[PDB]
Amino acid sequence: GLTGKLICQTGIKSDGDVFHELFGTRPHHVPNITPANIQGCDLHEGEFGKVGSVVIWNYSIDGNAMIAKEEIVAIDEEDKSVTFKVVEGHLFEEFKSIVFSVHVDTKGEDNLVTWSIDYEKLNESVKDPTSYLDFLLSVTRDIEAHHLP
């Protein structure tokens, strides 16, 4: 009753590999590219690019500042996927667990970015976090504009 999943898919015109590796090996560059959405990304444990690394994200939705500490639980080169599990922060005011994954599909002509949000609400009154899809699309658009020469 408390579990849900939200997915958004959108095209990018920029290089898909570069988009994947931004998240997979260069997540600390994200704030520099989408500063209205993401203000910081600090390495807390481990090393950038490795499974089990932990980063602290400083970000904003609707003008409110928030913090998420996240473990990189999966990085797959073939699927061009990176999975970030929240382990502390604002979102644990609402969710028992919440995991963000980004996949890039570069087959064929048109690159597709897919963001998934997999979560368990603390209780049934918690809202499904659809505002995070609008955040992830904004981040995605900003990355695409930055990477297009």
Length of the chain: 149
Query: What distance in Å separates the CA atoms of residue 30 and residue 28, rounded to the nearest whole number?
Result: 5
The span from the first CA to the last CA of the chain, in angstroms, equals 46
Q: How far apart, in Å, are the Cα atoms of 103 and each of 2, 39, 43, 67?
A: 25, 23, 22, 23
**Given resolution (angstroms):** 1.5
DSSP 25: H
Residue 117 · residue 8 · CB < 8 Å: no
* Token reading at 63: 């003008």
What are the phi and psi torsion angles at 63 (to 5°)? 85, 0
Phi-psi region of 29 (alpha: psi -120 to 50; beta: other; left: phi over 0): alpha
**Contact indicator for 68, 57 with CB cutoff of 8 Å:** yes
Q: How far apart are CA 35 and CA 132, in angstroms?
A: 16
What technique solved it?
Answer: X-ray
Going from N- to C-terminal start, the domains of the chain cover 1-149
Residue 142: CB atoms within 10 A of its CB come to 17
Contacts of 7 (CB under 8 A, 6+ apart): 114, 115, 116, 117
The superfamily in CATH containing domain 1-149 is START domain (3.30.530.20)
Amino acid identity of 139?
A: V
CB proximity list for 93: less than 8 A, separation 6 or greater: none
